[PDB]
Design a protein around this nucleic acid. Sequence first.
RNA 1: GAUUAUUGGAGGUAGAGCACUGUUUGGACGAGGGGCCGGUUACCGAAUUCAGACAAACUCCGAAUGCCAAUUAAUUUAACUUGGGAGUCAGAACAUGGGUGAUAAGGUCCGUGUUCGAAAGGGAAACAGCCCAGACCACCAGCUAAGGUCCCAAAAUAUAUGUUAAGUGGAAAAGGAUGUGGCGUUGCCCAGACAACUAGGAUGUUGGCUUAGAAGCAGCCAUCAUUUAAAGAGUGCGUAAU
RNA 2: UAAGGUAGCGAAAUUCCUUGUCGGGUAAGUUCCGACCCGCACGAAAGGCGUAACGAUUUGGGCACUGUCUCAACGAGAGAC
RNA 3: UGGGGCGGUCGCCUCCUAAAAGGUAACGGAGGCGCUCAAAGGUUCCCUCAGAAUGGUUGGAAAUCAUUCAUAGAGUGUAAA
RNA 4: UUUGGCACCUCGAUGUCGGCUCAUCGCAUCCUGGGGCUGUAGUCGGUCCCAAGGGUUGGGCUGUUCGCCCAUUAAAGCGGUACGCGAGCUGGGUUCAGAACGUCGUGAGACAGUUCGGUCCCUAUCCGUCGUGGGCGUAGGAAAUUUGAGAGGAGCUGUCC
Lengths: 82, 175, 37
Amino acid sequence: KKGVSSTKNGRDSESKRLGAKRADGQFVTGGSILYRQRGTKIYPGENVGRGGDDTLFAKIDGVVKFERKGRDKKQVSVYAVA
Amino acid sequence: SRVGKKIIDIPSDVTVTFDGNHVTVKGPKGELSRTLNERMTFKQEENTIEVVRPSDSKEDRTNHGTTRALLNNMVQGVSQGYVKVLELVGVGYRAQMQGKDLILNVGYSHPVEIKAEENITFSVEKNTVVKVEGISKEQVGALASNIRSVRPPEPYKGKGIRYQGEYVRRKEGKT
Amino acid sequence: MKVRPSVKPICEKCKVIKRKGKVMVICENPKHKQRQG
RNA sequence: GAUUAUUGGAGGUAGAGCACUGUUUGGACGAGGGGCCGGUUACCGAAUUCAGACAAACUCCGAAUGCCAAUUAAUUUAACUUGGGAGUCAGAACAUGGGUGAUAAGGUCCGUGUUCGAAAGGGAAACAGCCCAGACCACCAGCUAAGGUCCCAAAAUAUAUGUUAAGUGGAAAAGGAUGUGGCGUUGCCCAGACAACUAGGAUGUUGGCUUAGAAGCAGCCAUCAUUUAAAGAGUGCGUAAU
RNA sequence: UAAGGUAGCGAAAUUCCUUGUCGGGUAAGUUCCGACCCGCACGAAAGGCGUAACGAUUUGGGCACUGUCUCAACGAGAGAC
RNA sequence: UGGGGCGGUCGCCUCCUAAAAGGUAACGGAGGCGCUCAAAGGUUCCCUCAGAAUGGUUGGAAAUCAUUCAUAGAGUGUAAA
RNA sequence: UUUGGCACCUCGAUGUCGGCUCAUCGCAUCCUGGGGCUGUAGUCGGUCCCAAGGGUUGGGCUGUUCGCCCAUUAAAGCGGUACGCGAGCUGGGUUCAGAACGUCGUGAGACAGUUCGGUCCCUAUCCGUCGUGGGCGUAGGAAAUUUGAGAGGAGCUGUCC
């Protein structure tokens, strides 16, 4: 049609699929991922590596336990009982 | 819609007989029939009466008062005379009496004439004390209240048909 | 007095009476009682 | 594989809520500037409290519901892999959630459901998406659904109850009646409610301002007792004083 | 800047303000003629101004004339039937 | 591309829309990017808040310094989280 | 019944603003008509209501939509109907190809800023409307006159005495 003019703000980011990938009670692999985050919402505990981007992995295979960490924070405790 | 302080409706020597739904004013001066109502059962013990109010419905209690006040108008007018006194003035245009009639030189094409009524006494004392004696309010009270409107007192001069309790007003006479 | 939207009497000896059935008010306040919801 | 009882967990929605961030301080609060000579007081910057209100891009809090996974339990019947052959990319309307638009649009974009498309039949008068509901073929058999039961047209002019008077039923908003009941109060209230028939409803004295003189309207009242069954330095409609 | 339109013609096949201005003409002129220039975007060889004659040329006005028309009616015919 | 249309924009990152898992639109809302640190990196051993008032050479209150609380309100190389 | 927004129908065509001739419905009425009512004695002006039954000029000046004017009139209405009607009329206008001017564009060319000029087809099959006949029937047959179920038409005004 007629004059419609310059126009700017349609800018956003091709997203990323963050958060968790596995859950309570579930059994895992060695290089298995347990979470994709940024910062520390949760804190790796037992048998847990933390890669560069705050990604957490379990150092072993085994099953999980999320739990509190502090008085008000949270962590992981992988166990490979079998 | 506030009328019910008086609901007595007592007869007189004039006799309130019946003709069915009709009801007849008779006696010394009477022989005029008219229907009171249907549900409003009227009754006279010896010489006292009052409209029975069956159920006092909206319609029934309005008809109570109709029949009460209208039979009161009857025993007022057919017995005594529904007598209403009034006066008359007609000025410049030659509004002239004719006894039981009148003429106006309104002075149109044709000056135009006026007449009297029937069964109602137009008793003229001095050509401006006219008594209108009849039988009731609905029709002859309508006569008394329409003769005033026949040629009513026009304000800015004051000529027309007046009651004994009427007056003339004026107008902001600005063409 | 000088005319209004209406006339300007107010009195309330309000003869809200039917004349043989025609409802009206023989009164001085036509300003308040209308229909209503 | 599925459904659900049993789990266990993740998480920050709705809602709450000011605790941060902060949106509009009502109030004061004391000062600084300031009116003033460095001062007074105003008000503020601001902060002091008290104090509340608000939030898509505010959160100390925080659901339901859904997501993931469990000897998870039981009841179902799936489920997965491989590879062969395909069509689909303009979707539409309703409920619903949201945005945008004008708390416009049978709009427009996403989303959660459902139907059509690809699905007839019954109901909505007719009426692709609405309500009920899936047909293998017969059959002059029966039971029901949505909806319906005075005639066209099948079924109750059925019962029993009510409300309403408008043909509402079978035209909307605001505004405004009681027009009526009801439901509860109200102040009554049998002395006697509350409009009305009506009893008498008048003064030393408009006294002060008395405004065009004006002595209930184009206006301020010091607004003193009753003549007295009930009553006023005059309840009520005049815009000429009366 | 290299310089800024000179004559001139002007609200014009080109005026937005604009029917700018104002008569003449018509009873009445959104035009026409005339004149004022306030020239958006006026100017002289892809020329400026004025000219007799010329024109199946454009436009305004008038006279004649007349069924163009009020206001339509009759006849003749070809069609028609 | 709510007809083409002029305008614009076209590649990446943060948030909100987004509906408590994740994921998701709009010529829909707000903002950063087309790098930088040989020290802002690595590794041992210390420190620990701005800010606020408190307030006083300073004083445009405040700088510097000092008393006490401050939620990391400090701040962290590069927007927002 | 304005300017709009949405893009459903129609681009294997629903083909034109105006005006002409015809209409035809409304009312939120201009005239007439009635009433009431006022800062209306009637008029006045104005007002409110009832009112739609009817009626509602002719010229000049703009294709222009449009308005302005000159004279009348009782008024000189507002609307609706494919912005009522073009298989009934013209096309003035706009749009066609030419040409001119002004502006813009390097230019091709564009604008709209104007102007002159520039091609409007149809044997009516159905429904439908105006009329016209034919057929048949109306418990006996023929001629003439008839009632009318209903349907249609009719109603404007102003003036002198």
